[PDB]
């Protein structure tokens, strides 16, 4: 099961041919790792 999952992911891996497209496709996007926790143990995602 791990080899199958890994075989699909490799389709999305960066390569020398698709390097420029993926570099530009990243400058347009934003990835947010920020989130806060509450006294009840609930995650409070950011307002975006």
């Amino acid at each position: 099961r791990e080899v199958l999952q890994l075989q699909e992911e490799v389709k999305n891996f960066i390569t020398r041919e698709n390097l420029e497209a993926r570099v530009e496709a990243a400058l347009d996007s934003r990835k947010n790792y920020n989130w806060a926790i509450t006294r009840e143990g609930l995650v409070v995602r950011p307002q975006r």
């Binding site: 992911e9 999305n12 891996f13 960066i14 390569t15 020398r16 390097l19 420029e20 993926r22 570099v23 530009e24 990243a26 400058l27 996007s29 934003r30 990835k31 947010n32 790792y33």
Partner: protein
């Protein structure tokens, strides 16, 4: 193994930032790395002033590069980033998602007698 490169780039315009990322990802590939993803965390003010290559920086572009590489590539990549003038600060860590979190039943109490005895 699987690594995560936390990359702070000098605040630049879009064309020069893309050239730095391409030049940085190509250096990884030249050392045998298989690059998995590239994530932009956004441009922000640094938590403190950072001096790099005879310049002072207050803002930077935060990027992540998820990739697999041989253990010997890390030392060579750390050296590569130290010479790139467009990189403010770059650190290579073992990817956090590789480490699997062990389940926790809860907080087991500690006997007080052990505390003072220990």
């Amino acid at each position: 193994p699987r690594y995560e490169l936390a990359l702070i780039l000098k605040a630049m315009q879009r064309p020069e930032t893309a050239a730095t990322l391409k030049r940085t990802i190509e250096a990884l590939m030249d050392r045998g790395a298989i690059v998995r993803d590239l994530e932009n965390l956004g441009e922000r003010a640094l938590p403190y002033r950072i001096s790099a290559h005879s310049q002072q920086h207050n803002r930077g572009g935060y990027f992540l590069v998820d990739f697999y590489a041989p253990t010997a590539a890390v030392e060579s990549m750390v050296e590569h980033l130290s010479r790139d003038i467009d990189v403010i600060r770059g650190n290579i860590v073992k990817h956090p998602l590789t480490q699997e979190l062990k389940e926790c039943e809860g907080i087991v109490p500690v006997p007080l007698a052990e505390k003072l005895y220990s």
